[PDB]
Paper text:
LSSmOrange and PSmOrange have been engineered from mOrange and PSmOrange2 has been engineered from PSmOrange using directed molecular evolution. Electron density maps show that LSSmOrange, PSmOrange, and PSmOrange2 have the same chromophore structures as parental mOrange. It consists of p-hydroxyphenyl, imidazolinone, and 2-hydroxy-dihydrooxazole rings.
Monomeric PSmOrange2 has been developed as an improved version of PSmOrange with faster and more efficient photoswitching. Replacement of aromatic F65 (present in both mOrange and PSmOrange) by aliphatic I65 is accompanied by a dramatic decrease of the amount and intensity of light required for an efficient photoconversion. S217 in PSmOrange2, forms a strong H-bond with catalytic E215 and both, S217 and E215, adopt two conformations. In conformation “A”, the side chain of S217 is oriented away from E215 and forms a H-bond with the main chain carbonyl of Y72. This makes E215 move away from the chromophore, causes break of a H-bond between Oε2 atom of E215 and N2 atom of the chromophore (4.4 Å), and provides formation of a new H-bond between the side chains of E215 and Q42. In conformation “B”, S217 points towards E215, forming a strong H-bond (2.6 Å) with its side chain and pushing E215 closer to the chromophore, facilitating H-bonding between E215 and nitrogen of imidazolinone ring (3.1 Å) that connects it with the protein matrix. Substitution A217S in PSmOrange2 induces the shift of E215 closer to the chromophore and cause formation of its H-bond with N2 atom, increasing polarization of the chromophore and its quantum yield.
Numbering used by the authors: 6 to 64, 69 to 226
The structure:
């Protein structure tokens, strides 16, 4: 009754990437029990961004479809919600660090995101805007030290046909005691469905579903 079959969200992000300061404000909506969501984002400070939008898109776990037999840590955390901290280590030394708060206010999810990105090479695909969206990912979720930890090897498509990899670690922490699942996998596909000419208005789509592992966690 706390999380309805349809839920909206608002997101505010503040960040710096290689020293470039920016802010994003957005609104999203989706069906949390179906693993479907969309969002429309606006760059409100620092636009147009001089780097690939794709590094920001993975910066909304309440909208993961969980089978009944896998406890849903994220949904169970509400109304209080949860928080997360993440490091994304890109293969060329680029690094993004993130904090996030997820709350429920006035019947919608509220996401506050703070991030810092550094060491993206000036001639690399992020600063040269040569990326073309993320391949589908498998986030391996593990209960550890009283939290849920996620690990991902993520692959960003490049305009030239190759891929640019990021090793991701996240700690997700509920704001109250919640039943922890065993270790499991969240399958994720995120698309940038539309954008204006300078990526100051961007729309995203994401589908996510939890599953049991088959081969070793």
């Amino acid at each position: 009754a706390i999380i309805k079959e349809f839920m909206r969200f608002k997101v505010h992000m503040e960040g710096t990437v290689n020293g470039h300061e920016f802010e994003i404000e957005g609104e999203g909506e989706g069906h949390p029990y179906e693993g479907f969501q969309t969002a429309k984002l606006k760059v409100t400070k620092g636009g147009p961004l001089p780097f690939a939008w794709d590094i920001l898109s993975p910066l909304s776990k309440a909208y993961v479809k969980h089978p009944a037999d896998i406890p849903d840590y994220f949904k169970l955390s509400f109304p209080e919600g949860f928080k997360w901290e993440r490091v994304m280590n890109y293969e060329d030394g680029g690094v993004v660090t993130v904090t996030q708060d997820s709350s429920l206010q006035d019947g919608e999810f509220i996401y506050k995101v703070k991030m810092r990105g550094t060491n993206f090479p000036s001639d690399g695909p992020v600063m040269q805007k040569k990326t073309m969206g993320w391949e589908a990912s498998s986030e391996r979720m593990y209960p550890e030290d009283g939290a849920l930890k996620g690990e991902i090897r993520m692959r960003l498509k490049l305009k030239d046909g190759g891929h640019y990899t990021s090793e991701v670690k996240t700690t997700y922490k509920a704001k109250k005691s919640v039943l922890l699942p065993g270790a499991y996998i969240v399958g994720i596909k995120l698309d940038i469905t539309s954008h204006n000419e300078d990526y100051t208005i961007v729309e995203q789509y994401e589908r996510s579903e939890a599953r049991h592992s088959t081969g070793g966690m």
